[PDB]
Amino acid sequence: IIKGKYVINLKQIAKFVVGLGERVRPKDIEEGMRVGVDRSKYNIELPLPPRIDPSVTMMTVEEKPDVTYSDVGGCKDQIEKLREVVELPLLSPERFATLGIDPPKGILLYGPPGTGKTLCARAVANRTDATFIRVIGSELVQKYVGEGARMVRELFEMARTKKACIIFFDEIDAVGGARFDDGAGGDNEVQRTMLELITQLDGFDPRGNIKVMFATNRPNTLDPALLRPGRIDRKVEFSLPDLEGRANIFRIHSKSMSVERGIRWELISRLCPNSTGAELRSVCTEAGMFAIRARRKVATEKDFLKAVDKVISGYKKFSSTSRYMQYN
């Protein structure tokens, strides 16, 4: 911008000097903005949105799946913490203005898999009806280095323009991990985009209504500046269902199934050890394959017993009956 003409460099790389037609406003030219100019005598006709370099961030914008907000298991309290950090200030920043506090924005989702880590975030996507922009950590790694630096930076600023949005950082165990040195590694080139995640969160400007979720399988390795407590503010450990919690989940699941009444959802929880509800989602469906085997339209107590044995035995045959990779 030259103060009182403009210098454009075309995409045909070729630099020209242009000005203002009569559908342009001068107040409406900004640095790095794309414009349309006449294919013959270059002159601005209609300015255009900035930045044509992103085109793969329009496929990570996602409509909200109606997994419903009641779909999530239990009436347990960990999801009610979330409803204080993320959901409520979108509905009501009044109470946070009456408090005067800064409203918390970030939160960590962590804990074992099969607890429905992402299943409660699909529920919360139902309720809040804010934009959900979903990221895959391994989708942030490209053939050449510095290419993913472009990606992350631009993704963030596009979200700044968006108003009432949420960015759901999924599976960022790769890019997102801890920083360390190798001296000959190839991890360095990855750690570049790891850094790119830090420099946008704090920024030199705050996040203007960007609510931020990180979903990690592991706390065992993470950055200490993407896990600093002021930008992930409250972090909620998501736990294994209790002996009551499994009864609640299994009731959501068996109320959805045709079973013949007089059964105990308590009994099946007791038979199981401390376990996932994703197993409970599969006690029903494998008991239903035993239901079709006997050619019932219904499901009874008998076939539930077989199913409970079936899953436990395979669990023992498999990893993560003790794996947490220590820490609490």
Partner: peptide
Amino acid sequence: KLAAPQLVQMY
């Protein structure tokens, strides 16, 4: 205002 990762480019 400069962030170092910006200097990293695949160009």
